[PDB]
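EI: anyone free to look at a 63-residue chain?
SC: sure, send it
EI:
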Amino acid sequence: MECYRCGVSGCHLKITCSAEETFCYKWLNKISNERWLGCAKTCTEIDTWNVYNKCCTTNLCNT
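SC: here you go
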């Protein structure tokens, strides 16, 4: 599986997940609009004053 990740060129970059990294994350800073995307072994959904994070478990799901 792969997930999207972000760099200077945008958030369309692809990264291979290990077998244990069964999540793609999409972590958004609600204050700065920073996007943090990738593969992870653990993923907790978050919806606070400053953070939104969504978790998903299929290839390139963190659009």
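EI: The beta strands are 2-7, 10-16, 23-29, 35-40, 46-47, 51-56.
SC: 👍
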